[PDB]
Design an enzyme around this catalytic site. Structure first.
Site: not given
Ligand SMILES: CC(=O)N[C@@H]1[C@@H](O[C@@H]2O[C@H](C(=O)O)[C@@H](O[C@@H]3O[C@H](CO)[C@H](OS(=O)(=O)O)[C@H](O[C@@H]4OC(C(=O)O)=C[C@H](O)[C@H]4O)[C@H]3NC(C)=O)[C@H](O)[C@H]2O)[C@@H](OS(=O)(=O)O)[C@@H](CO)O[C@H]1O
Ligand SMILES: *[C@H]1O[C@H](CO)[C@@H](O[C@@H]2O[C@@H](C)[C@H](O)[C@@H](O)[C@H]2O)[C@H](O)[C@@H]1O[C@H]1O[C@H](C(=O)O)[C@@H](O[C@@H]2OC[C@@H](O[C@@H]3O[C@@H](C)[C@@H](O[C@@H]4O[C@H](CO)[C@@H](O)[C@H](O)[C@H]4O)[C@@H](O[C@H]4O[C@H](CO)[C@H](O)[C@H](O)[C@H]4O)[C@@H]3OC)[C@H](O)[C@H]2O)[C@H](O)[C@H]1O
Length: 481
Positions: A225, A247, A308
């Site tokens: 980052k 980042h 971001e």
């Molecule tokens: C605020 C922000 O942008 N922070 C980023 C961070 O983003 C976050 O990434 C997580 C992730 O682990 O991918 C993401 O959570 C996941 O979101 C998806 C939907 O897009 C699912 O949520 S759900 O719709 O409510 O189900 C997912 O849950 C999983 O769903 C499924 C499925 O149906 O495919 C199977 C699984 O059992 C279930 O866990 C959910 N994961 C988790 C662990 O809850 C957040 O929404 C998102 O804000 C990251 O960036 S990004 O590139 O991944 O987007 C991170 C880098 O890794 O960087 C931060 O800055």
């Protein structure tokens, strides 16, 4: 002098002068609070080490702070910890917190220390905002971490909801010959290494010759980052995550090995945000890729420029080799639906990767995996430049004409790449050589005094019963009641 108890260690450390040598007698130093405020000098460091590395244990409610400069901490084994869970936090100081510049922690072992959330080592800002620089963390082993936060955080700014054009200063640290193998935590739990916090931060840290083996803590093996960090010759073996340029523009990854050699989990891999990067001579051979990210070796982030979730564009991807990747070699628009949501909410302009210079890459497959080499749902003729690549073994997936002549494959010579100030590596020379060497083994990075790899997770993908019970308790107390 030689010290054999916490009390005598505290006293000698307050008296030691530049060039001094403090040797800790064989034994266990329980609840040890080692605070070193004195300083050594250039050419005259102060060394605090085990008289016999492997025989000195720092345990219990312990803490080490290197506040002075030109200090060396060597040969300590941290285990059987018991810090207060209500007293430590992710984003705070590590078990070992380095507050001064020109400090080195070498040949130390950190093994499932305790249940308190924090990194195992951090470079930390003092209350007056001074940023440590020129430190080194090397030949250390980090295994079975069952707590939140990264294994190592290299900080140049205090955590803040941020976004002011002001960024942290260049750090010039080096993390080399370290071993990382840690279990998977839920969510945004803290990975292997974090460097900086936001895009205006300047890193200029060198991370080379480390072995990440089942470094599975969270989605990010490394969340880089800050600008201008150089990742050279690291091996990522069966890691459930990706090494990320999260980042900060103008980051460098050269000659790293990304290997997945079984079907147990999806492995990575690199996820790239931002522009002006140099990603060259990396080797990707992944038996399984990560479904949640989009099943690929190299993921190029779509989104709003310099945001971001900064758009990945205007960078050099050269002389890399994607060999039998069970997924796309390159995914040009992973997580695009979430990125469109982020852009709509902030009234930002959603864009997709372009201006990429793909030169001299080898894309090869001779195993029955089903993925074409590329995925680009937003393909536009001419947006990227492809020269000297070779692709053979499966359809490309996009309308780009690439030679399929493997025998004629040759990495390309590059000579216009500026080096990173403060990092003694000739990027032009290294890239022009092509991919050198091979994946690193434990014996190539281990502490000089330790023959056996510690930890229970690296070789099994499962914590032993006792450690698993503690991990379960940490996870449970961090979530909803
Ligand atoms: C605020 C922000 O942008 N922070 C980023 C961070 O983003 C976050 O990434 C997580 C992730 O682990 O991918 C993401 O959570 C996941 O979101 C998806 C939907 O897009 C699912 O949520 S759900 O719709 O409510 O189900 C997912 O849950 C999983 O769903 C499924 C499925 O149906 O495919 C199977 C699984 O059992 C279930 O866990 C959910 N994961 C988790 C662990 O809850 C957040 O929404 C998102 O804000 C990251 O960036 S990004 O590139 O991944 O987007 C991170 C880098 O890794 O960087 C931060 O800055
Ligand atoms: C990270 O490390 C890995 C290896 O662990 C590298 O992996 C390779 O590349 C990967 C991409 C591949 O995946 C992998 O398979 C590998 O191919 C990776 O590239 C990274 O490299 C970086 O770290 C290396 C590391 O630390 O291991 C660096 O290598 C070191 O570079 C410095 C070398 O020291 C010099 O050579 C030694 C032998 C000393 O010189 C000899 O001194 C003798 C005594 O004075 C003399 O008789 C001999 O004639 C000299 O040749 C050393 O000198 C210095 O120390 C000596 C005491 O030993 C004296 O005090 C001298 O005064 C002093 O100068 C030399 O210094 C230049 C070291 O041997 C080597 O291991 C690598 O350069 C990084 O890029």
């Amino acid at each position: 002098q030689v010290v054999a108890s916490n009390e005598t260690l505290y006293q000698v450390v307050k008296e030691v002068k530049p060039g001094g040598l403090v040797q800790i007698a064989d034994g266990t130093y329980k609840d040890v609070q080692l605070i070193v405020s004195n300083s050594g000098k250039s050419g005259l460091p102060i060394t605090i080490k085990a008289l016999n590395p492997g025989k000195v244990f720092f345990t219990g409610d312990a803490k080490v702070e290197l506040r002075g400069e030109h200090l060396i901490l060597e040969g300590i084994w941290f285990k059987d910890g018991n810090r207060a869970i209500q007293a430590w936090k992710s984003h705070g100081p590590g078990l070992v917190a380095i507050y001064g510049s020109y400090n080195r922690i070498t040949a130390c072992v950190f093994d499932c220390f305790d249940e308190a959330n924090s990194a195992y080592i951090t470079t930390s800002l003092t209350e007056d905002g001074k940023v440590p620089q020129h430190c080194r963390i090397d030949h250390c082993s980090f295994t079975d971490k069952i707590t939140f936060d990264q294994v190592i955080n290299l900080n140049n700014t205090a955590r803040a909801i941020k976004d002011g054009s002001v960024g942290g200063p260049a750090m010039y640290h080096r993390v080399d010959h370290c071993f990382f193998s840690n279990p998977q935590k839920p969510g945004n739990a803290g990975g292997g290494i974090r460097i900086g916090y936001y895009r205006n931060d300047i890193g200029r840290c060198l991370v080379d010759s480390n072995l990440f083996m089942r470094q599975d803590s969270e989605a990010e093996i490394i969340t880089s980052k800050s600008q201008e960090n150089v990742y050279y010759g690291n091996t990522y073996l069966n890691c459930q995550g990706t090494m990320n340029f999260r980042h900060g523009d103008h980051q460098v990854a050269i000659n790293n090995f990304y290997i997945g050699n079984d079907q147990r989990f999806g492995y990575g891999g690199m996820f790239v945000w931002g522009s002006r990067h140099v990603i060259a001579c990396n080797y990707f051979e992944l038996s399984e890729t990560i479904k949640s990210r989009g099943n690929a070796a190299l993921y190029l982030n779509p989104g709003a420029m310099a945001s971001e979730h900064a758009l990945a564009f205007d960078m050099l991807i050269a002389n890399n080799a994607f060999i039998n990747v069970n997924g796309y070699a390159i995914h040009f628009n992973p997580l695009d639906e979430r990125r469109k949501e982020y852009c709509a909410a902030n009234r930002l302009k959603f864009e997709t990767p372009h201006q990429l210079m793909l030169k001299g890459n080898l894309f090869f497959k001779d195993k029955p995996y089903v993925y074409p080499f590329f995925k680009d749902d937003y393909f536009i003729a001419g947006k990227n430049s492809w020269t000297g690549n070779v692709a053979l073994g499966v359809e490309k997936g996009i309308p780009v004409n690439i030679s399929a002549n493997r025998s004629a494959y040759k990495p390309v010579k590059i000579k216009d790449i500026q080096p990173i100030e403060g990092i003694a590596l000739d990027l032009n020379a290294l890239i022009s050589k092509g991919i050198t060497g091979k994946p690193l083994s434990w014996d190539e990075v281990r502490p000089y005094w330790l023959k056996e790899m510690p930890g229970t997770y690296a070789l099994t993908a499962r914590l032993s019963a006792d450690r698993a019970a503690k991990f379960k308790a940490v996870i449970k107390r961090n979530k909803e009641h």
